[PDB]
Amino acid sequence: ARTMQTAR
Amino acid sequence: RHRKVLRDNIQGITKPAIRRLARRGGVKRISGLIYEETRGVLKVFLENVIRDAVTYTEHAKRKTVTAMDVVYALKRQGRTLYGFGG
């Protein structure tokens, strides 16, 4: 949602 | 006594002089932008040889950059020079 992330 | 820091004697490697140097290298037409590029090339060559020329003297504790120390600077970079000895 608003959590930053790598590769999705 | 007197105190001068030199400025712009690289303009002594003169535009006709880089022409004569080119002639012995066998060239016919020299673009006008060469004369600020050779000066760039020469100023890089002179640095690396003097920095090794000095480092040899400064090791031997002298204030004169003698002719054998210049030659060892050249001999180290695989330019060997043959008229000054050893």
């Binding site: - | 002089a17 016919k28 003097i50 480092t55």
Partner: protein, 95 residues
């Protein structure tokens, strides 16, 4: 008035046949002391160790111009340019 480009060939043969030094002495011996200012201050130059630097810088530029003029010729023209000099230095390893 000669054809442009034939005084050149009359000047190539003249310099290649002789062995005197092509840069003037005093504008060179001053350049060496300017560059030797950086690495040590107030050096003396045993005055045959500037002749040992003309004869190794002149004979370096001339071997570079022989390698520049082969590159300009290879790009199908007869005029060396700074995009040749930078190639000849890049192929020898220097830059």
């Amino acid at each position: 008035r000669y054809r442009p480009g034939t005084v050149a060939l009359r000047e190539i043969r003249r310099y290649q046949k002789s062995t005197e030094l092509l840069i003037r002495k005093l504008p060179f011996q001053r350049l060496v002391r300017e560059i030797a200012q950086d690495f040590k201050t107030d050096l003396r130059f045993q005055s045959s160790a500037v002749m040992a630097l003309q004869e190794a810088s002149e004979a370096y530029l001339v071997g570079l111009f022989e390698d520049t003029n082969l590159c300009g010729i290879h790009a199908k023209r007869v005029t060396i340019m700074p995009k040749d000099i930078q190639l000849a230095r890049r192929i020898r390893g220097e830059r």
